[PDB]
Design a binder for this molecule. Sequence first.
Ligand SMILES: OC[C@H]1O[C@@H](O[C@@H]2[C@@H](O)[C@H](O[C@@H]3[C@@H](O)[C@H](O[C@@H]4[C@@H](O)[C@H](O)O[C@H](CO)[C@H]4O)O[C@H](CO)[C@H]3O)O[C@H](CO)[C@H]2O)[C@H](O)[C@@H](O)[C@@H]1O
Ligand SMILES: OC[C@H]1O[C@@H](O[C@@H]2[C@@H](O)[C@H](O)O[C@H](CO)[C@H]2O)[C@H](O)[C@@H](O)[C@@H]1O
Ligand SMILES: *[C@@H]1O[C@H](CO)[C@@H](O)[C@H](O)[C@H]1O
Length: 752
Amino acid sequence: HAVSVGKGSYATEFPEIDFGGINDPGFRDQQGEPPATIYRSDRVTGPMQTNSWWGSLAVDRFSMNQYPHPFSVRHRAEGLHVFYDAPHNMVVHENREAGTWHIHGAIGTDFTIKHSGTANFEQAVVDDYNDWYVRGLLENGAHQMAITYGVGSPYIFVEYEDGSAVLDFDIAPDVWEMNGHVIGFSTHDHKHYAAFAPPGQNWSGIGSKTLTNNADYIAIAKLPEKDGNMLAKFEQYAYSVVRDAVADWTYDEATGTVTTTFEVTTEAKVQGAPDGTIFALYPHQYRHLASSSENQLLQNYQYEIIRGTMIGLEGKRFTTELTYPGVLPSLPDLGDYDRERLIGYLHDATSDYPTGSDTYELGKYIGKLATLAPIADQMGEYELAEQFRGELKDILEDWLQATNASGQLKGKNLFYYNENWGTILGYHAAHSSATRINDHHFHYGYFVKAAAEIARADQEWAKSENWGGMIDLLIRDFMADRDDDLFPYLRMFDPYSGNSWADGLATFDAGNNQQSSSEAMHAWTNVILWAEATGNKALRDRAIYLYTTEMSAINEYFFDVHQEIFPEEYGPEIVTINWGGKMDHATWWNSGKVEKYAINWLPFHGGSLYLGHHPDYVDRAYEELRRDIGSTDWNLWSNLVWMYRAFTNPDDALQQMEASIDDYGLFDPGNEKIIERGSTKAQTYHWIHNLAELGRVDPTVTANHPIYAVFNKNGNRTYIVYNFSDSPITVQFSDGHSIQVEPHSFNIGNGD
Ligand SMILES: OC[C@H]1O[C@@H](O[C@@H]2[C@@H](O)[C@H](O[C@@H]3[C@@H](O)[C@H](O[C@@H]4[C@@H](O)[C@H](O)O[C@H](CO)[C@H]4O)O[C@H](CO)[C@H]3O)O[C@H](CO)[C@H]2O)[C@H](O)[C@@H](O)[C@@H]1O
Ligand SMILES: OC[C@H]1O[C@@H](O[C@@H]2[C@@H](O)[C@H](O)O[C@H](CO)[C@H]2O)[C@H](O)[C@@H](O)[C@@H]1O
Ligand SMILES: *[C@@H]1O[C@H](CO)[C@@H](O)[C@H](O)[C@H]1O
């Protein structure tokens, strides 16, 4: 009933849960498993993909509404509904009393793609998928309709078995170009589309509500404009059905460059169809397009979507280039703090305890301890640092064992492998981490943080045959490489959308969602640190790719740093929750004003410096939150606002901190006014004083090793490197600066 992995183990049978006398139905229902039924064909075997834009197809009998941008679609018994949010469909609404804003479209139908033989399909299943397309299969015995579609595809490819094509409309469309087998058409409300069949298979029903074609293959395209030259271009790739799609990446450690090539492989549905497609690129992609891909752009081919403007690009592949900025295990000892006051705060933190038994609340607590230990080391409090790391070891050694002293499965504080889907679930569970396969990056990221801090001081503990095997198992659950026998590829991450999706099932009409982009970045940071500490280059580089790509998405869709994506009428300077089909300034729980910003900042750690790359954004967002609050009397989590403010104005952050940090004493679960419960006074005090001495984050300088940061105060740069090696190293920076770093240390600010 359990599998040994080094000194640890995971359960292979669902445990008999220890509820601890808690009768609350919500809590009890969390200690379960994901759905027994997976709507996939017998062509889809092995660990099932989750946390995808398309997941509702796998979980629901049919599907819920999905956003393969530029389209929205949904599977039904009658066929596939297709929709496009035009400007008249989009709204921006504010609820002043709730403090919420919503940018959204409609759940309409422009037309339904149908099968001539049936409008009563039994189910829709996942029949194939790749890095960002899916093949959905509507099934009714001999009648089948296979639909291939994806984020960043302006095509929907339709393949029929035992029937032919039908497009059904509630109001008759305007067919403005009739080329026989190819038609350009518009909905009654002027949305422009095209349909393509093989030569000789001509469309019928023009002028009526129902367009028909005898072919066993059609493609639908969303056209950027009512334009026959564009229709002719779409015709060129309309018979090249996407079968494979991969996002392959490299990390150039010398330059920091992360290069990602998106490549499709198509199957020809007519003689001579080219191996390629027309991609629709998101802002985070085209703003970083490689020079070599520029010639493939279709300049005037634009689509408006929730995420701004998509642009067309033709061919087999395209490439993006990003800059990995480094991460640190902790900020070093460079602040102008009262060392005795900080030491006092470090000892105060021994009063802290987890506010629940689930993986998330336990996670927040071990993240807190892992953050305190390096600061204790810096202050010369080696014995206190050892207490914290000893507490981390005791917790991890408990959770990473599935069996008790007798050899039977435990009822809590363990991990279990669900074989049906192929995922590691932790009990106790919360936020539907087990029942919906939610948030595995958010939760397990904190476990990796604890492991990485242990590994920084104790390489032996972190060896695979000891406790490292189980940590590497948790990491595989949420970010596996290809051909992993237990887990699907990069579970959390959508390589094309550029962000992680938090919900395992995606059974919402807005598609999938992500709230805390900062907890995702925290997970990626901790894997970089863990992998560096344990000598695992392939793992480290994968986490670098994730960190850097997620950052590009965050700056577009959560922050809109370029002031191009959010509608002008949208008041806030942040989107709290990104969905496939909408954007919310709102939280998953009932909160106040600060939390709707700070849930995309927390936790603060050595990988948080990405938050300060755009100082005008940091100012703009802070100022808007301050305007809405009406003062610096933060409704909750004051310390997070101060730490954020320190990215651009550490003097202001310092005066706010001095005025209120000691308003309350030791850890109090009921009161997060001043200190958010995953944070501490020691962390807050250490952070703000470091930023005061260091100045602004400087993203214009890179290094030829991955564990570093560069700051800039009025033209004077500070270069920080941590060296995880047993040997000394030399680090070259891109501005010509060079430093030596001794084993297991920072170059500067090691402390006592
Ligand atoms: O922060 C403000 C308040 O936020 C509250 O949490 C909301 C949350 O309620 C919301 O969830 C909705 C889902 O309810 C919705 O489910 C649909 C089903 O109800 C329906 O029957 O079926 C369809 C599928 O066919 C479902 O989609 O789905 C939408 C997305 O499609 C969700 O948004 O999500 C909000 C974020 O978007 C979230 O803020 C919270 O509970 C309050 O405490 C808080 O005051
Ligand atoms: O720790 C900050 C706040 O986190 C909130 O939970 C978030 C969830 O909405 C979501 O499921 O992802 C993770 C949890 O898995 C969190 O970011 C808590 O509800 C808040 O109590 C907490 O203050
Ligand atoms: C988030 O945190 C608050 C307390 O800070 C709690 O009341 C909510 O239930 C939890 O989700």
